[PDB]
Amino acid sequence: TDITIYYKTGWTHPHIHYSLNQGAWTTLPGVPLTKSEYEGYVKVTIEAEEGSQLRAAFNNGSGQWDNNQGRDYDFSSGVHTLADGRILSGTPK
Ligand SMILES: OC[C@H]1O[C@H](O[C@H]2[C@H](O)[C@@H](O)[C@@H](O[C@H]3[C@H](O)[C@@H](O)[C@@H](O[C@H]4[C@H](O)[C@@H](O)[C@@H](O[C@H]5[C@H](O)[C@@H](O)[C@@H](O)O[C@@H]5CO)O[C@@H]4CO)O[C@@H]3CO)O[C@@H]2CO)[C@H](O)[C@@H](O)[C@@H]1O
Numbered sequence: 365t366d367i368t369i370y371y372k373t374g375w376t377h378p379h380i381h382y383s384l385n386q387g388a389w390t391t392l393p394g395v396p397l398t399k400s401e402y403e404g405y406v407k408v409t410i411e412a413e414e415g416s417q418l419r420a421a422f423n424n425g426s427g428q429w430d431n432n433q434g435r436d437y438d439f440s441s442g443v444h445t446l447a448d449g450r451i452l453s454g455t456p457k
Contacts, residue, residue, distance in 0.1 A: 367410040367418055370445040370456050371397055377425035378406050382418045393425045402456045405445070416441050 371378065381394030397406035410418065418439050421431035431437075437446060445456045 365412065365414055365416075365441050367412050367416060367439050367441055368407070368443045369397075369410070369420075369439060370400060370402065370405045370407045370443075371422055372405050372445070372447040372456070373397075373422070373430075374404070375424040375428070379423050379425050380408055380410075380420050381423060382410070382420040384410065384412060384418045385416050393423050393427075396425070397422075400456075405456050412441055414441065422446075 369380065371380070378397045379394040380397055381390050381392060383389045395408055397408045400407040419436045420439060421429055421436050423429045432449065437451065443454050445452050445454065
């Protein structure tokens with residue numbers, strides 16, 4: 365149901381800035397990701413109803429962005445890890 369994301373990064377104030385099910389975009393720079401139980405990863409869990417989808421781009425809280433070469437990243441309900449351009453399900457590998 366909720367969208368949970370693990371994101372690999374060295375940035376110290378990483379943010380995910382997203383639009384949930386095609387609605388309003390978050391206010392910039394977005395929602396900050398918290399330090400995770402996995403070396404080099406941060407995590408956020410975005411609350412969402414069944415069958416939800418978000419569009420996201422990630423940033424350092426300041427304008428260095430990771431936006432999947434301008435296309436942004438898509439996520440569905442469930443857990444995912446974004447590592448170096450690539451989404452995989454579940455928690456970090
Ligand atoms: O509101 C209309 C708009 O909404 C959605 O945009 C969202 C983006 O898809 C999402 O990535 C995020 O955008 C970030 C972006 O990732 C980050 O790189 C930075 O953007 C830079 C551009 O990369 C840069 O090229 C330049 O942008 C120019 C753009 O090239 C030109 O084509 C024209 O559109 O003017 C743009 C800006 O005036 O500068 C910006 C920095 O100013 O920052 C972006 C966030 O500020 O967030 C967007 C929502 O905030 C839609 O998906 C998008 O297609 C729609 O047009």
